[PDB]
Every structure is written in C-alpha cells, then in structure tokens.
C-alpha cells in the first residue's frame, strides 16, 4: 500500500557515482559530441544555456549557437522585448534559438510573436511540469504550431515524462531541486537526486524514442558526461555559464576581484503569493563563453575516450557506473 | 532473541529524505492547511509553538492563535502565573490556548487553575512519556476533566504511542532527541531519528484514529512538510520561533547585530540531581512572528503543490519519499 | 574462501547508533550503576581510568576508587616506583587498585613487587593481545597468582576473547584503534569500529560468564551507556579524564586558557624499532575528577531511565539500538 | 541488459575499510617486506616511486633502490636525457631502475636507448591502458625485448588486466582517478574507488600468476598495507615522496616554511588538444627519502604484526577487512 511504500525509493546524485573505464580504440579529439533533439533540431555539442535572467539573452544565445550549442531566451521581459532578442539571434547568420513560455493567459500572444521572430524551439518552462496547466498548454502549442520543436518541463518521474510526451511534447526537461542557486529542497522539501531523475525519465523516453534535457546541478565537466551517460540527450547549464562575459549581468569589482550576479528565477529579485525558492549570489568572472565551453567539452571528450564511447548514443546505451560513499 | 536484535533497526532523519513530485491540479495558494487535532480542537495551520521559557508565554500564544496556530504556555512559573497567562490569551478574542503540566504532586493544583482560566488543551510534557508516572497522570487528568483536549508525550515508539492513547490521551507528542538545543543524544545516548519516530508512531495512531504532534528538529519549511508527510498531524517549533519578537526573551545587541536567547528546558539556566540535557545559545533576531509563519507556510504550500496534495490528510496518506545519501 | 570473504564484514562505531527509549518505571537517581568484574572485584560505577602516563598514577587511582571506580597505574616507570604508587593507594583507606604489566622479561619482577604492594588487579596491557606472548603470560600470571584478578588485552574479535579467557584471564579488555590520541588506524591500517568490537567480544564472553572492559573512543557520557548496552561490563577512559587535576601532568597556561598534556602511550614522548602509533596534544583543564565523574554518571543515569534499565545487567541483555546515517 | 545494470556496481576506497587484527606470533621487526615482481625483479620493500616530473629522476631512483625499492624515471624529457638518468642509476652500484615509455611513434627510439642504458623494467605508462594503442605496444615491446620486465597500465578492471597480461605484460599497474593531485574524476567523471580496483584486478591476476602495482591515492602508511592486503604486490607513490629532498624540484621558502612543488602529469605546467586532468600545488618539505620510507615501512610492519602476517603473500591471501561508514 501507499502507506507501506512511503520510504521504499532510494536515489542517487552526481557525487554518488563514477563512470567505469572500458576498452577504447578512440582518441578524445575524434569522439562525436552531436545530438539529434528532434527531426528539425540537431546540436553539435550537447549543451543548452538556461532560460534565466542572469544567464541567457541574445549575446549568450548567439555565442552558444556559434559553439554548436543552444540558448534559451528567458521570459522575464516584455513579449516584444523577447521577440526582439530572438530576432537578433536569427539575424546573426541564421543560428538556432530557443525561447521560454509559461502557462499564463499572455502565452498565446508571447508564443505568436516568438514564432514570428523565427524561434526554432519553444520551452514550456515551469517549476512543476506534471500539472494540468502544463499538459493542456503542451496540447495547445503543438496544435497551433505543429512545425515548432516543443520542450516541456520540469519533471523528475517516469509517469510525468510519459504524460508530457503523450500530450505532444517533443523533448522533456528533467530537474526538480538540483540547481546550484535552488532552495526548492530546503523550502518545499521536494526533489529527486538528479542521477536517478535522469535515469527514471530516460527509461520512459526510450519507449517513445524521444529526447530528454538533464537540467540543473552540474558543477564540473565530469557531471556533464555523468548526466549524459545516465540517459540525458543534452544538458542545461546555469551556474557554469553565469560568470561568462556573455551572460546578461554587468561585471562588478569587489576587493580587487571581478564578479557577476547569479540568481535563481524563484529569488525575490527575479520575481519582482509565492515565497522564494532561489537565492541571489556573486559568482567568479570566468571570461569568455568560448573558453568555458572548450574546457567543459574537453572533459566530456576525455571521459568518452576512457569509456570507449565513439558518440553520445553509445555512451547513453552502454556506459556503466559504479556507486560509492562520501 | 533480544541479544541478536540489538542492532536490527535502521532509522531516518529529515536530511535523509525528500518528497517525490506528483501529478498536480492545484496552486499553492488554494491548498487547505487546516487540521482537526480532536473533536473540539481545529487549527487553521498545522503549527504549535513549544512549551519553553524562551519560546511561549501569552504574547506568543496570542500571535500563534491569530495565524490559525496554537501556543503552549510553559510551566516554568508559578501556578497562578501560568493561569494568568492563559487568562490573557482567552481575553484576546476567545483565541485557542494550551498549557503544559507535569507529573509532580503540584499538578492537581496547576491543572485545576489552568482549566478555570479557560485552557483548551492540557499538555502532559515530559522528557520520557513511556513511563508509569505519565500513563497514571493521563488516566487521572482524563477522568477529572473529560471535556479537555489532552496531549501526552514525548515518545518515539509505536508501543509507547499505543500505551498513551489507551490510557486516554487524545494526542501523542513525538520527539526523543531531535531538538536544535537538545543534548539528549550526546548526554544520554538515546534517541530515534525523527522521520522514523513520526512514521512508527503515526502507523500506530492510524489504528486508533487519533492525531500526533511531530515535535523537534525542524530547521526550515521543507522539514515541516516532510514531518507532516511522514505522518504528523501538526508540528511543534522551538528554534524557528525563538528569534521572533513575540518570544519571552528581550532583544539584545552584540557587535551591531540583534540576538535573542534560546535555551533547552533541560539547560542549567532553565532547571534553576539531573545533569543538563540542553544548551543555552544566542539566535538571530527574525522580527515579527507573522513574517516567519508566512514564509514557513508558503514553503509548505509549494511542497503540497509539487505533490498534488489538496489537504494535509491526502499528504499524510498518499505522498511518497525518496531516500538519499549525504 | 578467504579471498572471497575479504570485504564481507561491516562494522559500527558510537556515532552510527542510538539507544531506543523503552517502558520505564524508574527515575535516573534510583538506577543501580554497580558491576561485578570478578568474584573478588565489585565496582560501584562502571568506570576505569586508563593505564597511561598522562592519565593514571596514585592521585587518579585514589580519586577514581573514592567515586566507586578503579584506576590502572601505568608501567612507564621503575618497578619499585610502580609498587610505591600501588602502596599509596592501599594506604588511602584500603581502596581498590589496578596496575599494568607487559610481556617483557622484567614482568616476573614487576608482578611480584605489585602483588606484594597489595595490588587487587593485574592488567596485561598490550597493543595486540591476540598473540602467543600474551596468551603464555596469561597462563604464567594465573598459575603464579591464582588469587589476583587478571585483565588481558587489547582485542577486537570473538576468537581473541575466547583464547584469552581459555588461557585463564578473568576479564578481556576490548579496543583496537578507537582511542582519541590513537593513530593505529592511520599508521597500521588496522582496527574494528568500537560498537561492533564490543558486541562481537561480549557475544563470546556471555558463553564463558566473564566480563569485558570497553576501552577507548568515548567522547561523552552518551558513548559510555552505548558501550555498556553493546555488551561492555565497564568502560576505560583516557581523554575524558586527562584534563582533570588528578591526572599526572602539570596544569599549564596558554593565551589565558589552562591546559593539560594528553598523549598516546605509543607517542614519541611516551616511548622515550617501533614507529609512533599515538599523538601528543593539549586538552582543556576540566577541574576536579569528582565533577567530571558526576556529569558522566548523570548522563548514564538519564539513558538508563529512558531505556527502563534498573541495573547494568538489564541494559546489556535487553536494551535495543537503532542504526543511522551521518 | 546494459541499460538495467548501469548502477549495479558498488565500490570501496581506502577510507571505507580497516584490516581486522588476527592471531599473531611475529614481531613487526621480523616480518618479511620483500616482493617478487617478475622472475628477474625482486624488491626488498613493496614501494615504487612514481614516473612524474616532480617525483622521480636519477636522485630519487638511486635512494629508492638503496632502501630496497624502485624508481620510475619520468619520460617528460629528451630520449638521450632519459637514457642518461638511467645510466647514472646503473653507475651507482648496479641498483635496479625503471623507466616510463608511451605509445607515440618516438617510443621505438626511446625504448632502445633506455635498454642500452641498462634499464631493468620498462613501464608503458598511460592515462588509459585498456586501449588498442597500449595492447599493440605491449606486444611490440615484449617481442623486441623478451628479457626486459614489462609493466603496462593504468587500468581499474578485471577485463583490462586480463587483456594486458594476455598481450604479454609481466605486471599490470592499477589506478584510474585516485591520485592526490588528480582531477580525472572531476574533469572526466571516470574512475573506480581504489580498494575495489585493486581487488577486481588482483582477482584476475591470481589466475595468471602475475603481479599488480597499486598506483595512487595513498595518503599514509595505513593505506599502503590496505593496498597490499586488497591484492597489490607493490604500491606506487607520488604525494608521499614529492616533498622529499630527493624529488626533482627545488626547495623554496614561503612565510618561513619550506615547500616543494607537486603537480600532476596532466597539469598545464607538465603538459607544456587535451584539457588538464591534474593540479599544481605546494607540499610540505619532509626532509630525506630515507626518513619517510622508514616511517611508512614501520607502519606496514605494525599492521602485519596485528594481522599475524609473516610476509606479503600471507597478507594478500589471508588478511580480512571490515567495511565502515564516515
Ligand atoms: C517560487 C518558485 N519559483 C521557481 C522558478 C523557477 C524554477 N525553475 C526550476 C525549478 C526546478 O527546481 C524550480 C523553479 C522555481 C515556484 O514557481 N514554485 C512553485 C512551486 C509549486 C508549484 Cl505547484 C508551482 N506551480 C508552477 C504553480 C510553483
Ligand atoms: C534533564 C532533562 N531535561 C529535559 C527537559 C525537557 C525536555 N523536553 C523534551 C525532551 C525530548 O528530547 C527532553 C527534555 C529533557 C530530563 O528531564 N531528563 C530525563 C531523562 C530520563 C528520564 Cl527517565 C526523565 N524522567 C522524566 C524522570 C528525565
Ligand atoms: C607503537 C605501538 N604503541 C602502542 C602503545 C599502547 C597502545 N595501547 C592501546 C592500543 C590499541 O589501539 C595500541 C597501542 C599502541 C605498538 O605497540 N604497536 C604494536 C603494533 C603491532 C604489534 Cl604486533 C605490537 N606488538 C605488541 C609487538 C605492537
Ligand atoms: C590529460 C590527461 N593527462 C594524464 C597524465 C597522466 C596520468 N596518469 C595517470 C592517470 C590515472 O588517473 C591519469 C593521467 C592523466 C590524459 O592523458 N587524459 C586522457 C584521457 C582519456 C584518454 Cl582515452 C587518454 N588517452 C591516453 C588518449 C588520455
Ligand atoms: O529559483 C530557482 N529555484 C529552483 N530551481 C531554479 C531556480 N532558478 C532556476 N532553477 C533551475 O536551476 C537550473 C540551473 O541549475 P545550475 O546549473 O545547477 O545552476 C535552471 O536551468 C533551472 O531549471
Ligand atoms: O533541554 C532540552 N533537551 C532536549 N530536548 C529539549 C530540551 N528543551 C526542549 N526540548 C525539545 O525540543 C523541542 C524544540 O525543538 P527545535 O524546534 O528543534 O528547537 C521542544 O519542543 C522540546 O520537545
Ligand atoms: O598511542 C596509542 N595508540 C593507540 N591507542 C592508544 C595509545 N595510547 C593509549 N591508547 C588506547 O587508547 C585508550 C584511551 O582512549 P580514549 O579515552 O579515547 O582517549 C587507552 O585506554 C588505550 O587502550
Ligand atoms: O595529472 C594527473 N592526473 C591523474 N592522475 C595522475 C596525474 N599525474 C599523475 N597521476 C597518477 O597519480 C599517481 C600519484 O598518486 P598519489 O601518490 O596519490 O599522488 C601517479 O603514480 C599517477 O598514476
């Protein structure tokens, strides 16, 4: 019964696992990092920048797309403002671009202006995607724009993933509570350790033949490959990209050291009724996006070389982990 | 045998678990936070302030009741003094009030004056409620005042809970060793990690159709919902409320920062023969009770929205957890 | 096979367990703390001070015996010097006294002078008691002095305990690696977490009807009751008693704060060929032995009151624990 | 299936285990520390210094060999430079010496000059030895020089070990990610906790009757004996030897304290395309190699005395561990 199964489940995070090295005949420089997210969207690297007001606006989306990745333009701005940012990305050599939409009544206006601006992928981005509001919005957006790649989230269970894909989503975004600036676990007591959330959701996605985005909690390149090997098609980054020059914030100095503001979309500052679910902090200035992406992808290339993985499909389907203690 | 089963049991604390998000068609603002503790006592929020000399006197009991909660007037004062505090709460618009009683010979005098003062709930509050002294006091108080709501504790086992409810208690208070200022675990080597203590005691309480109060160890709003989802009908708070303006202590300044004194009822200072079982410390001034209660209940509302819980009964009976490592 | 069973065993320390509260009809002040170590030796409290040059000489042995406990005069001094210390203890009202002996060739001379001085218990104290040298010394000492209570150690296994009791030891002392100043685990990679070491050794001792001393790793009163409840008849203390006025060292001041020197018997300073197995450090001045013993025994009394244990036999045979995470 | 077994494996590190003390009739001074690595190579102590530019050049290889150990001359220098270092070691009384070779095209030239210089053991040292490049190099080196002792690595699995021994390696070197200066786990998300890596690889090596070198992650003498007892024939040290006078770096002063530079062979500084897999740091000056080796071997002697191990073979085949928590 439900009473008896209350504590049956046990879950794993990035720090609980390591990839086991395997027979390899490939050098890190020769591995294939490309991923087919939908029949219309292919990325050259499995990295997506987060739809956050301290992470992705036009500058970040352009630089990400230039590296073979993707940017999610945040929705904490006017509808025409969001459309204008998408337009600049499209004007920068026809680069791919994504944009976040909600479930509020203004969504129909927002979705229309973004599609008119040339957006390639719409992201129904909510704190809790296993809801009637999200499922109905997935159906409406897919019915209205059947030629637009649709991401829906955030989820952390197989049942939620099944419901989003069945409602018409092309991609399901995974992550309830793992974020660096996230206080969801502390404030609401809810969450699923990210490695188990990815694995459970990817187990379901394999039945549908559709992709998942592993969103949140990635601290280093090692966590990227672990996220992909657990079942994620691509990863979403907030913290690792917030300190780059290309993020929306201004570079400020403090006691001789340069910093950039990084905040949760559920923080008081971002929300300006709901109690905060994110913090506002200062992160070290990391220089250009180009440098950070190269170091992170180099780490992924090393791990694929250790696992004998020629491409991401082989890494997802064959790579093995070991569990460990602290 | 007893020798062979010495280390069979394994227990969980708040930090070992998280609630799993589920299908939801309800917004945090629309969830129902009310709880029926007894046929005569209904709270609008599942929060009770602790019977401690640095937490609850008339001011705290009035503010708590005003928020839909309850206050437990501490017994570390004269019998007529305790009766006077209850009287002020009753004079403040007929608000609900509780008062702590012991097992000492002066209890008959104390219980009579509190009942005459209009007390709604008597709390037989001891460090160890699974005792002959407590069970006999439960029988006596219930026989003398059958119209008064009776809480008895503290316990951490199913057998203890069964014995207290069978002796005539309406509500059983759960918590042996989890408190913030508590040194019971360190000093006496006794205790049950609070999530397992709640679950084991609520498993028994379900058979009797009676309520349990999850007492101690709550550090944030996330721990409140975890305490309720593990089986608690309401939670008891010490640390989270000690820094509010409404607590009995005076606001003192230290190096430009404001603080309030918070101490265990088993500390040297509070006890003024038994060796101390609590510490005396300084806690950050948090301002008004009203602000702290709103932030804590907002966090509970978010978690119920993630779990799809419309009310606390559904959260207790259906919500699922996951276990995790450090 | 031995290869396949290399990592089969799993062990518990003090910090992994807590005692479960049980039905109680006894107040902490009324519990019985006495223990029958041998037909000739009964203690009023289950506490023995360690045979260490920074813990027990005549002053500590007198004060310990006065509290109902026992002191082990260390052997890092001349044979006649050790005999002189035992003599002072016996001259102080016929109080009980113990003295440490080794396995070296000078032991016959040392054992004779200590017995002539009126020693009640001889302690064959070695870093590794599961050895041919110790077993032969047990046989020799018991054959020579059949009327003297004989302790032999240190061990951490059932097979070792069985071998020491069968060789003629009356009491087996348990503890390989748990000490506060001990570097045995770090230096030699050997040890058994103390709760499992006590339990495994007490499981064997129950078959022989003989006592065990739980030696090392006790940081607070809570660890004392856990040590006894896991199967120990009495506990041995080093760290908790080193800072008392009665320990052999002189009280020294450092930046306005008083300290006492505490060192392992395997430290460079104590040993003055073997590489050190203990450190030399400064511990906080705790005042009189009388005060420390009262606080520690008060904590034990509280735990026995929570467990419903009237005496130590009931605590050893019936008390139950719960395991927990960090 | 591969999908279902993704998280089946669980692994142990040095800090998760302790050796269980056993029946002993041997003193630490009388234990035998010698090991037969190949029919041509016998060491008097089971210690090999690492092939790193901050650990082993001629000075370290001479001192190590003088203690009964072995040094691995690093390959981050000219072919004739490496040959010159080997020559100095051979000129110092015919002491044993080892030298590292890669899988690059210049290897044939390097291997020939080292063999001509009198090298006793060639070490095919790579970050990932379970590769086509390494296996082919093992075959080539063994075919060319059948009279030279050949080490191949690094590996962490039974299948990898089997493949290296079958290709013709005499000794397999174990260690993927455990190093002190190693960022492989963090950067590439790959690794096997070292105790399990040794055990799994030694399980396979027992079938072939060949030796394994436990490489990396040893912080103290206790970790050396644990590494050997888990199945390693000898251990390889980097961190523990980097601070000795005999290491290639120069002794530098910082705020009155002496330090030596210690860096990973995958650090930016050492590599001077691949992203770094090691850090560059300052380690405390430990004085002479002779002193450090004596303290480390003394600790190993103590542990063998506790386990009753007369020699390393008995320690590998019979010694038992216990698992524990943090
Ligand atoms: C204040 C908080 N803010 C955010 C903002 C962005 C987020 N982005 C991702 C995640 C995933 O942990 C959580 C987030 C929370 C938030 O929206 N809570 C929240 C909690 C429960 C429910 Cl049912 C809902 N529904 C969407 C109404 C919203
Ligand atoms: C000194 C200590 N003080 C307190 C005071 C308030 C407490 N309130 C709650 C809890 C729960 O950990 C413990 C508390 C200990 C205390 O009463 N110990 C204590 C220990 C064991 C037993 Cl059997 C008893 N019985 C009631 C006689 C009392
Ligand atoms: C240096 C060290 N010193 C001490 C001194 C007192 C101790 N007292 C207790 C314990 C228990 O961890 C260890 C101790 C180590 C020590 O004696 N090691 C040691 C290690 C292994 C063996 Cl087989 C032996 N045998 C007695 C010859 C001695
Ligand atoms: C940059 C790094 N540097 C080093 C250098 C020395 C090392 N020595 C030992 C270990 C074992 O963790 C790792 C090391 C990494 C390195 O070589 N990575 C690396 C990663 C994956 C593969 Cl498949 C390969 N193959 C040999 C081409 C190399
Ligand atoms: O305030 C917030 N609360 C909880 N999660 C958040 C919040 N803001 C953003 N997130 C999530 O955290 C991710 C960033 O994770 P990070 O890379 O670990 O910093 C975003 O992509 C969101 O899914
Ligand atoms: O001195 C004490 N020792 C042990 N527990 C205490 C003491 N004083 C109060 N408590 C308990 O700790 C609770 C407060 O827990 P907190 O909210 O974690 O601070 C109270 O409601 C009591 O049940
Ligand atoms: O140098 C040493 N190495 C290891 N154990 C030691 C040493 N000296 C004393 N011990 C043990 O540690 C105990 C004291 O433990 P403590 O009370 O945790 O400080 C003594 O009774 C001895 O059994
Ligand atoms: O940069 C590096 N990355 C990873 N492992 C390294 C690196 N450099 C050396 N190692 C390994 O780490 C070992 C030294 O380990 P340590 O004794 O724990 O410092 C060497 O013998 C190598 O196997």
Strand order of the largest sheet of chain A: 5-6-7-8-9-10-11-12
Residues in helix, % of chain A: 25-40%
Structural class of chain A: alpha/beta
Number of strands of chain A: 16
CATH architecture of chain A: Alpha-Beta Barrel
Q: What count of domains describes the coordinates of chain A?
A: 1
Pathway (chains A, B, C, D): Purine metabolism; XMP biosynthesis via de novo pathway; XMP from IMP: step 1/1
GO biological process, one term (chains A, B, C, D): GMP biosynthetic process
Family (chains A, B, C, D): Belongs to the IMPDH/GMPR family.
Active site (chains A, B, C, D): 182 (thioimidate intermediate)
Describe the overall structure.
Chain A is α/β, with parallel strands linked by helices and 326 residues long. Chain A has a single domain, classed as TIM Barrel (Alpha-Beta Barrel). The first copy, chain A, is built from 12 helices and 16 strands. In chain A, the strands form 4 sheets. Chain A has an 8-stranded parallel beta barrel with strand order 5-6-7-8-9-10-11-12, surrounded by 7 helices. A 3-stranded antiparallel sheet of chain A has the order 13-14-15. In chain A, helix 1 runs parallel beside helix 2 and helix 5 crosses helix 7. The first copy, chain A, is globular, with a radius of gyration of 19 Å. The two termini of chain A are 33 Å apart. Strand 1 of chain B pairs parallel with strand 16 of chain C. The structure holds the ligand C[C@H](Nc1ccc2ncc(CO)cc2c1)C(=O)Nc1ccc(Cl)c(N(C)C)c1 (4 copies) and inosinic acid (4 copies). Chains A, B, C, D: GO terms for molecular function: IMP dehydrogenase activity; metal ion binding; nucleotide binding. Chains A, B, C, D: Belongs to the IMPDH/GMPR family. Chains A, B, C, D: This is Inosine-5'-monophosphate dehydrogenase. Chains A, B, C, D: Its cofactor is K(+). Chains A, B, C, D: It catalyses: IMP + NAD(+) + H2O = XMP + NADH + H(+).
